[PDB]
Amino acid sequence: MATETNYPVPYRSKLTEPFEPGQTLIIKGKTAEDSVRFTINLHNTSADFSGNDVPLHISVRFDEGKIVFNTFSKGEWGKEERKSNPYKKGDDIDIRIRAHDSKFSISVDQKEVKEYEHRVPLSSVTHFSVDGDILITYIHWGGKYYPVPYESGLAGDGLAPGKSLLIFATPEKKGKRFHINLLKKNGDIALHFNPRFDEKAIVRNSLISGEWGNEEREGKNPLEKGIGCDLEFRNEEYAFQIYVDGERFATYAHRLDPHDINGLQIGGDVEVTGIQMV
């Protein structure tokens, strides 16, 4: 209701392909002190008809103080399922919906709060809409089931200054530690990002010619077992700017010339749900 900008509401988007197991839909926005409610719908339709079926309807109610889930099909609504609404009028919201074969897992502020079993085909979801008292500031749909240990190459130029590698993951509930390596062609690790819960610290280092370097820790681990996190590795001219959940966690001065960072590896006790180059 403030600055239209991107994603103005009523917002609607036709998916390029049907929503599939794995795959997450992320919605972030701002609310006003007078916001009453907003909705997020996964639905069916041709491309302008609208309605039809709504496999998953999410209603965030500030008046009722609840988040409500339901399904509409064959012209009828089923029985609503509710959870408490942790948000107060005003303040930002972060809701994420990941599809699985037997249900949708919905997280609020990166915390799992609802498991909604499919009532109608997940495949009938061809669009998603957002409407109501919310100023959308971020939307993204994609990802998949990333096996871990994970391993792959990066684009053509890969990670170069001016670019950033965005990773969505959730440290495992009973995990001790995990790591992410940004590698160069010859196999050297430009950056080793290694959160260690058993040591309450995130270790950063580089692997050059089979040798581990100095090693930088300290900064207070901002991650939490079982809680989702948004990791951003901003490659800059003099260093990597490491962002955790929107806040700069650390800076890591380059030990290997940046440029040509074309490899990625992820291992340890962690679940990866999204990887993207921005």
Ligand X SMILES: CC(=O)N[C@H]1[C@H]([C@H](O)[C@H](O)CO)O[C@@](O[C@H]2[C@@H](O)[C@@H](CO)O[C@@H](O[C@H]3[C@H](O)[C@@H](O)[C@@H](O)O[C@@H]3CO)[C@@H]2O)(C(=O)O)C[C@@H]1O
Residue ranges in contact with ligand X by CB under 6 A: 179, 192, 194, 203, 205, 212, 215
Query: Is the CB of residue 184 less than 8 Å from the CB of residue 263?
Result: yes
- Residue 60 or 183: the one with the smaller Cβ distance to ligand X is 183
Rounded Cα distance, 140 and 29, in Å: 12
Element (H, E) at 130: strand 127-132
Residue with smallest beta-carbon separation from ligand X: 212
- Tokens coding 69: 């889930």
> Nearest approach, Cβ of 214 to ligand X (angstroms)?
9
Closest CA to 242 of 143, 162, 165, 183: 165
Closest CA to 206 of 182, 222, 223: 182
- Residue 80 or 215: the one with the smaller Cβ distance to ligand X is 215
> Nearest approach, Cβ of 122 to ligand X (angstroms)?
36
> Nearest approach, Cβ of 148 to ligand X (angstroms)?
12
> Nearest approach, Cβ of 57 to ligand X (angstroms)?
44
- Residue 65 or 149: the one with the smaller Cβ distance to ligand X is 149
Element (H, E) at 199: none
> Nearest approach, Cβ of 242 to ligand X (angstroms)?
15
Exposed, middle or buried, 152 (CB in 10 Å: 0-12/13-18/19+)?
exposed
Rounded Cα distance, 240 and 236, in Å: 6
- Residue 125 or 207: the one with the smaller Cβ distance to ligand X is 207
> Nearest approach, Cβ of 267 to ligand X (angstroms)?
6
Map 219-268 to HEC letters. CCCCCCCCCCEEEEEEECCCEEEEEECCEEEEEEECCCCCCCECEEEEEE
- Residue 138 or 212: the one with the smaller Cβ distance to ligand X is 212
DSSP notation for 133-194: S-EEEEEEEE---B-SSEEEE-SSS-B-TT-EEEEEEEE-TT--BEEEEEE-TTS-EEEEEE
> Nearest approach, Cβ of 149 to ligand X (angstroms)?
9
- Residue 46 or 186: the one with the smaller Cβ distance to ligand X is 186
Place of tokens 């948000």: 87
- Residue 69 or 249: the one with the smaller Cβ distance to ligand X is 249
